[PDB]
Structure formats: structure tokens, C-alpha cells
Amino acid sequence: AQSVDQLIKARGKVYFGVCTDQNRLTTGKNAAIIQADFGMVWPENSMQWDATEPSQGNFNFAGADYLVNWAQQNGKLIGGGMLVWHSFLPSWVSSITDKNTLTNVMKNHITTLMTRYKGKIRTWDVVGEAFNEDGSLRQTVFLNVIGEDYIPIAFQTARAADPNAKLYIMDYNLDSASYPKTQAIVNRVKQWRAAGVPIDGIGSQTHLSAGQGAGVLQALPLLASAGTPEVSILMLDVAGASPTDYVNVVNACLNVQSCVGITVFGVADPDSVRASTTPLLFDGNFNPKPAYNAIVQDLQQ
What we know:
- The chain is of the alpha/beta class.
- It has one domain: Glycosidases (TIM Barrel, Alpha-Beta Barrel).
- The protein has 13 helices and eight strands.
- An eight-stranded parallel barrel has the order 1-2-3-4-5-6-7-8, surrounded by six helices.
- 46% of the residues are buried.
- It is classed as hydrolase.
């Protein structure tokens, strides 16, 4: 079959990507499908905080290095993250109560990861899942100890570490224009950028139920109205994998000039965190599903 990354490039976008890691690249038919069909890889787990800094200042890059080396060998773009996130946080971080201490820990974690791969990473997800569903800021250790300034500090630190990388904020449940979280991230990103905070993109972590694709056609233009140079669909999966939902998400990105591309959450259904909903584009035999063929056909026209 045809390569959705090649076809989305022909439509003027940058990539169609996928999340993966060493475990996937050495099993199944994941490596071959990524080689053929996807233009960017993102680490499932190998660049998260618990994987890379399980004890303070004792960094472990084995899995991340594997992915970066594989991507360079195979000519793929690389995304990295998440640099600052309350999930997959080791306990040594969440037990810090001193502002100066946590600020220095966070800056060092960001700078160390970004320096190691300087110039090789297209996009870094700097901060993820920072908002509550009601649009207030999520009360994580970073917010509780450092304060609201932790987000500007994180982005300023990242820009200094690798000025070539695009810096993104990411969140989920940004799939409806009227949802409080969608409104808040737009408004706060406008304000941060007006104050000079270097936020280059908003990444929408799109986990849909059946029929929710239609709402993205209005939500993504709203996210783009915050003025970042880029937006993207990240970690996409769709319960039931209806072609209608998948084609709506692709068309939303095609309709938004600043949408650079789409990343799906994995290759094949059996490796999904919600496999009973068969939510991805390849089935358990690694055959492309009707939704994959529908995206191809949509992009060809």
C-alpha cells in the first residue's frame, strides 16, 4: 500500500508519525511498516523522566539512544518528550518541597536531555498535561512548589539548550472547541507568547471515542488561533478505528495551515493500551485497516 507520510508531504505537510521504541522495533513488523509509511518517530517511554533520570543526576539514555540512532539510520525525523510531566515522575522528584531545589532539578533535567541530542530532534514536548479539565492549572509538584512560573522557566530553559528544536506544550481533551480546557490552553498560550515565552507549538494528544472526529474540525482551528507557528495531532487513536473519525482528523490538519502533521499512538492494535477497542491503523496481522486505506485515498485526491 501507499505511504501516508509520503502522501501528506505531497499535500504540503511535514510528517505522518508514530510512537515507538526499541521493544517495538525488534518485534512484529513494526520496523518495516515505520520505514515504509511514517516519517517521524517519537519515544513511547524511553525519554520520560522515570526512564532517563531514575535517581537524581544518574541519567540512563540506553533506550533513547537506540531510537535516535535507528531514526538517523533510516532517515526519520525525531520527536522527544515529555520533559516536564507529572506522570512517570520518580518519587525523588515528587518529594522535593523547596522552590530553589526543584527549579534547579527541572532545569537540569531539561538541559541534560536536550543537550545530548542537540540538533537531532525536530520537536520537544516540553510541558504536558498542565491543565485540569476545568481549565485551571493542574496542581502537580511543579505548580505547588515553583508556582505558575514553572512553565515559562521550562520553555526558556529549553530554548537555550537547543535553539533549533520546536518547543511544544501538549494536552489531551482538546478535541471540542467549547470544552473548558480547550479555551484555557488557547488563552494562556496567547498570554505566554505575548510575554515572550518561546512556545512554538500546541500538540493535541487526541484519544477519541467513536464519532468524536467531527469535533476536531472545529477544535483544531481554535487551537491554532493562539498564534503558535505550529500545531499538531499527537498520540492519535480512535476507539473502533472508524474511517470517518480518522479522515476527519486528517482533514482537520489539512484545513489548518499551521498544522504540520499527525502522529499515531502506535502501529498495530494488539500493542495498544486499549487494544479491546482496536483503535489503530494496522491490525493484529499487521495489515492496513480500512481507516488506513481511507486516509491514503483522502490524501491522494
